[PDB]
Design a protein around this ligand. Sequence first.
Ligand SMILES: *[C@@H]1O[C@H](CO[C@@H]2O[C@@H](C)[C@@H](O)[C@@H](O)[C@@H]2O)[C@@H](O[C@@H]2O[C@H](CO)[C@@H](O)[C@H](O)[C@H]2NC(C)=O)[C@H](O)[C@H]1NC(C)=O
Ligand SMILES: *[C@@H]1O[C@H](CO[C@@H]2O[C@@H](C)[C@@H](O)[C@@H](O)[C@@H]2O)[C@@H](O[C@@H]2O[C@H](CO)[C@@H](O)[C@H](O)[C@H]2NC(C)=O)[C@H](O)[C@H]1NC(C)=O
Ligand SMILES: *[C@@H]1O[C@H](CO)[C@@H](O[C@@H]2O[C@H](CO)[C@@H](O)[C@H](O)[C@H]2NC(C)=O)[C@H](O)[C@H]1NC(C)=O
Ligand SMILES: *[C@@H]1O[C@H](CO)[C@@H](O[C@@H]2O[C@H](CO)[C@@H](O)[C@H](O)[C@H]2NC(C)=O)[C@H](O)[C@H]1NC(C)=O
Ligand SMILES: *[C@@H]1O[C@H](CO)[C@@H](O[C@@H]2O[C@H](CO)[C@@H](O)[C@H](O)[C@H]2NC(C)=O)[C@H](O)[C@H]1NC(C)=O
Ligand SMILES: *[C@@H]1O[C@H](CO)[C@@H](O[C@@H]2O[C@H](CO)[C@@H](O)[C@H](O)[C@H]2NC(C)=O)[C@H](O)[C@H]1NC(C)=O
Lengths: 238, 336, 41
Amino acid sequence: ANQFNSAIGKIQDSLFSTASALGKLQDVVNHNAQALNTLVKQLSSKFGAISSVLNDILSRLDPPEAEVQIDRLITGRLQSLQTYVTQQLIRAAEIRASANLAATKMSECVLGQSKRVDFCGKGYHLMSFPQSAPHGVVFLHVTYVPAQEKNFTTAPAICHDGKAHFPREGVFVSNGTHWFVTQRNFYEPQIITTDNTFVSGNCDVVIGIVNNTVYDPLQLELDSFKEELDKYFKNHTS
Amino acid sequence: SMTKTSVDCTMYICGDSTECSNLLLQYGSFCTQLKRALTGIAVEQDKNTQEVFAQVKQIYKTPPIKYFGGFNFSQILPDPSKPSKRSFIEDLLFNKVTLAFIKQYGDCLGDIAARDLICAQKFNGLTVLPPLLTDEMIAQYTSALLAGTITSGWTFGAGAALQIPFAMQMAYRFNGIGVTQNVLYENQKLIANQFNSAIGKIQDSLFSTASALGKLQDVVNHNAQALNTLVKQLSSKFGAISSVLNDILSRLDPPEAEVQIDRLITGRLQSLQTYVTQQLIRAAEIRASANLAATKMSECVLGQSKRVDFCGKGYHLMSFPQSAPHGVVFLHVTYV
Amino acid sequence: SQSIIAYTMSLGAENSVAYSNNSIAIPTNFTISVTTEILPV
Ligand SMILES: *[C@@H]1O[C@H](CO[C@@H]2O[C@@H](C)[C@@H](O)[C@@H](O)[C@@H]2O)[C@@H](O[C@@H]2O[C@H](CO)[C@@H](O)[C@H](O)[C@H]2NC(C)=O)[C@H](O)[C@H]1NC(C)=O
Ligand SMILES: *[C@@H]1O[C@H](CO[C@@H]2O[C@@H](C)[C@@H](O)[C@@H](O)[C@@H]2O)[C@@H](O[C@@H]2O[C@H](CO)[C@@H](O)[C@H](O)[C@H]2NC(C)=O)[C@H](O)[C@H]1NC(C)=O
Ligand SMILES: *[C@@H]1O[C@H](CO)[C@@H](O[C@@H]2O[C@H](CO)[C@@H](O)[C@H](O)[C@H]2NC(C)=O)[C@H](O)[C@H]1NC(C)=O
Ligand SMILES: *[C@@H]1O[C@H](CO)[C@@H](O[C@@H]2O[C@H](CO)[C@@H](O)[C@H](O)[C@H]2NC(C)=O)[C@H](O)[C@H]1NC(C)=O
Ligand SMILES: *[C@@H]1O[C@H](CO)[C@@H](O[C@@H]2O[C@H](CO)[C@@H](O)[C@H](O)[C@H]2NC(C)=O)[C@H](O)[C@H]1NC(C)=O
Ligand SMILES: *[C@@H]1O[C@H](CO)[C@@H](O[C@@H]2O[C@H](CO)[C@@H](O)[C@H](O)[C@H]2NC(C)=O)[C@H](O)[C@H]1NC(C)=O
């Protein structure tokens, strides 16, 4: 909880200081505004006519003579309009792709937990939170990052009684003298035990197998119970 | 990615002619728009390459001993016997796919056998910008990814690379597809032999069966075709008496030359606009392909994917990247 | 004095993974990372 709180507190500064992201929405706004500015500034071009003002052409020329300049302006401004519309269509396709990705991220990162690597942040995705931004969405991806590793001596299998033992869900590790079985993502060592492992064949096949005792809880419990029963018997029999 | 091109609007339309430039000023900011679009496309190409390949925090290296449980990665690991530390498969790929662009073409050849298409294009405003990342750098990125995945597994994609024996990493990958790890540990030699045979056959299958590997060649061919058409449209008259600006200027007085100049200007503006629109559409397609390739690198190489047919046919075990001209190649190791 | 410099890009810090032949690395502790992704809609 403390780590999450610290990270979400640092979010308020990392969102505006490191730059990097948050420039895509501004780029979209700037592109749209710049396209509109270009389209509206193309109205001062003559395109070969005597003036870029239609009223001047209509007021200084007869219909048959003004028609040529009017047609030049029509051609130029029509070309400008088609150019603007084509660029708008291509940018709309790009924005639609981005919005489809954003919808997929909302479905898979926020509404569920994703096993897709790097899809919902760097690390093992835990969850995600959405936030609205002008013309866009912001995903805060909460992920799990292993921090303080230590390297041990590992083996694929453990040979106990002429049999090969493999971890049920985990990995065999050794700190130098003793052998334990842990989970692969967090060092939580435990004694190797028949409930921790499963047997498959003998020890003559696995490359890298080592000898270590696989302690049997049933046999040791039976021995302890028999010792207690013997003590109880000797309490009165002898 | 695709070829980053720059077009000199004035030089293409009105090459070193001041009258044509003055007449072209009357059409507004069309040249500025074209230059802006082309610059955006080039920056997007560099971004595509960066997103696909620059996915490793550090440049991971393999240990000097190249034993990984009997698996033979020699044909995909870097080859130090070259100026560029490129693998065998990467060298084969870069040999097969041949670019038609920049190098140091400033000193174009002194007309030995006519002039190349590239030299002719470079003489009318059509130049090619080199990519930001050299093929050596892309090969370094690929080698770092391969070393990280064969020395740590999927751990280097979620934090610090935790080393693990390759047999045990393979056992975890087997557990990922629903098969117990004792299946791999008791068939380790057979699995290693099968992987070695498949990675050996990859060299023949990549360049003999064709199928794929024509996509990068299609990208190169389409870029070359567009540039060739743009440079060949300069010989069109578009209704004028001559397609040469100099002849029109040297044969007619300005009041009557301006009409032909404007006809040529309109034709060449239309050609440039068509070229730039097609370039934008093709860049959108290439960006879709690059986003797909980045997703494949993240979910197939940096981790094991449960998505069906995303990282090959069968039950995905792992994947290896190899750089190719303007593209990437994924070797998908799967369980059938 | 400050000046404009040209250089070759550094792709990253070269890290040689200590890949051993019967040795593994396991994390003993973790962090919770909140990253941010912006997407135009
Ligand atoms: C390697 O570990 C063993 C065992 O550690 C014990 O079990 C672990 C799961 C964990 O709970 C540890 O804290 C335990 O100590 C170490 O052997 C232990 O040594 C201590 C100190 O002398 C002793 O009190 C314990 O009884 C020992 N445990 C056993 C089962 O004999 C051993 O010292 C460790 N080796 C190294 C190099 O660190
Ligand atoms: C793992 O153990 C096997 C089994 O041998 C048993 O354990 C040994 C530690 C020792 O106490 C033997 O007497 C036990 O029977 C080991 O195989 C033995 O290898 C030695 C040396 O070559 C040989 O003299 C024994 O006859 C072998 N035992 C059998 C039953 O065949 C094996 O070497 C051990 N592996 C490791 C890496 O220590
Ligand atoms: C796991 O890492 C966390 C984060 O660094 C550790 O928590 C810190 O512990 C130190 C030392 O006691 C304190 O000064 C910090 O305030 C703690 N930080 C937080 C966010 O709580 C934690 O101790 C580590 N776990 C282990 C087992 O070492
Ligand atoms: C894993 O063990 C290895 C080997 O001892 C450690 O890697 C060494 O780290 C030191 C200190 O940075 C370097 O000087 C050595 O060159 C490294 N060895 C190799 C072979 O590269 C490593 O630090 C251990 N891991 C942990 C988490 O402590
Ligand atoms: C890892 O252990 C294996 C055994 O499973 C070693 O493989 C042998 O290594 C020796 C040299 O130490 C060679 O003479 C043998 O030919 C190797 N065998 C095979 C089948 O290749 C391996 O070297 C060990 N160590 C390392 C660092 O990889
Ligand atoms: C791994 O594969 C390489 C091929 O990339 C093998 O190298 C071949 O070795 C044989 C036998 O000496 C030669 O005939 C070939 O010409 C070699 N090929 C190349 C490309 O060098 C290498 O032997 C394999 N490794 C192992 C351990 O078997």
